[PDB]
């Protein structure tokens, strides 16, 4: 339950930063596998679930092509369709 | 006719060398600058010698060795490097003082304030203020491991070491927070040390911890004693509805040693930090003790919408100009995410120095809504006044 709330809040904060002209929406679509791994180990997912989480992340960044401030709102939606929070404690 | 006095070394100068020395005649031996009379292993302030009839001087001429300024004075939170020969503290020796960067910075007025030489008087001196050594002042903001500005949706609120090196933990009446100012002062909320509803007799205990992110390691690091408490007079404990002047300063009995995990934070100057839309980070050790430190980024909103929400939620309300609200109702997390009486850390992109703009004051509504803080910029003068005491 708390995982979904944290993700929604981070998405809304990124939307506000985009409305302020500080974080460009296209720049967000770039992230290396090392960054994904370090984020997944810092949040506390299992070492086995990291592959599923990376697949979900790649697919969700792929499915969202709208380059606007609502991008962060749509990506979040995808993360709920793939049920990514089940790989978190 | 005792023999003519002969200088042993080169720096010995006989004052008025007479052509011949007879009975009851004397000669005085001084030394050049930077050198001192010795005679054996001791030191002499003056030497004179006379003839004892049998042509023998009653005492032998001294040696006149060089003066030793001694070991240089210790620079607090600093050190020195031998610009000349190491271990040689004698006459004509230069040292270079330096401060422990990045946690401390030498006070300014550039290859002129940290250089100290050994003078002929026998002490380490500098061209400006010779007797006294410099002073390394603490660097306020500029955290050595700042939080990543590339925020992602998948973002754990757990803070890492060095992100907020100013966070403190207090277990006075309950779990509270604050920020470090300098190496000796702690800025916190007034209602953390004075209970609002409880009041009456105080179960005094205090205890202040800082230096880590995990609670157990914070406790292991040590309890810091407090020697003076300065509460703003506007705060009143009986008025449980009001929180005006919710600010206080604590003075440590001994100054802390600043490091990569322990750094203070600067005070505001211009009001551009309180502008709408500014993202401020609020840290706290969670509620319902929860272990490690957790942070949350919240935006400062319009005070008018906050007042509308306040009076619409049938609340007494105690908003003022010295306060500013943060957060958004669309945020699905609780309004108490400003855990403990911490601070509202905002980073100034012009100077890249983090500054504490607000203090976690009152948030009546542990469910959802806005958060309220106290403008530090308004109480800057009182903070500086209490610090200069």
PDB file of N, CA, C and O in Angstrom, chain B residues 95 224 231 277 282 298 334 383:
ATOM      1  N   UNK B  95      56.265  28.494   8.914  1.00  0.00           N
ATOM      2  CA  UNK B  95      55.267  27.439   8.848  1.00  0.00           C
ATOM      3  C   UNK B  95      54.036  27.988   8.142  1.00  0.00           C
ATOM      4  O   UNK B  95      53.810  29.198   8.082  1.00  0.00           O
ATOM      5  N   UNK B 224      25.144  13.965  23.520  1.00  0.00           N
ATOM      6  CA  UNK B 224      25.774  15.276  23.584  1.00  0.00           C
ATOM      7  C   UNK B 224      25.102  16.117  24.659  1.00  0.00           C
ATOM      8  O   UNK B 224      23.884  16.335  24.586  1.00  0.00           O
ATOM      9  N   UNK B 231      14.684  29.747  24.346  1.00  0.00           N
ATOM     10  CA  UNK B 231      13.366  29.615  23.736  1.00  0.00           C
ATOM     11  C   UNK B 231      12.849  31.005  23.402  1.00  0.00           C
ATOM     12  O   UNK B 231      13.021  31.949  24.184  1.00  0.00           O
ATOM     13  N   UNK B 277       6.413  26.900  -5.279  1.00  0.00           N
ATOM     14  CA  UNK B 277       6.994  25.913  -6.160  1.00  0.00           C
ATOM     15  C   UNK B 277       8.367  25.418  -5.757  1.00  0.00           C
ATOM     16  O   UNK B 277       8.862  24.459  -6.364  1.00  0.00           O
ATOM     17  N   UNK B 282      12.429  17.480   3.625  1.00  0.00           N
ATOM     18  CA  UNK B 282      12.197  17.354   5.058  1.00  0.00           C
ATOM     19  C   UNK B 282      12.566  15.937   5.469  1.00  0.00           C
ATOM     20  O   UNK B 282      12.073  14.968   4.880  1.00  0.00           O
ATOM     21  N   UNK B 298       8.847  18.085  -0.530  1.00  0.00           N
ATOM     22  CA  UNK B 298       7.547  18.732  -0.532  1.00  0.00           C
ATOM     23  C   UNK B 298       7.663  20.131  -1.124  1.00  0.00           C
ATOM     24  O   UNK B 298       8.667  20.820  -0.905  1.00  0.00           O
ATOM     25  N   UNK B 334       0.784  10.911   4.175  1.00  0.00           N
ATOM     26  CA  UNK B 334       0.312  11.693   5.308  1.00  0.00           C
ATOM     27  C   UNK B 334       1.000  13.053   5.351  1.00  0.00           C
ATOM     28  O   UNK B 334       2.113  13.231   4.851  1.00  0.00           O
ATOM     29  N   UNK B 383      18.262  34.383  16.320  1.00  0.00           N
ATOM     30  CA  UNK B 383      19.195  33.257  16.349  1.00  0.00           C
ATOM     31  C   UNK B 383      20.628  33.760  16.466  1.00  0.00           C
ATOM     32  O   UNK B 383      21.414  33.267  17.283  1.00  0.00           O
TER      33      UNK B 383
END
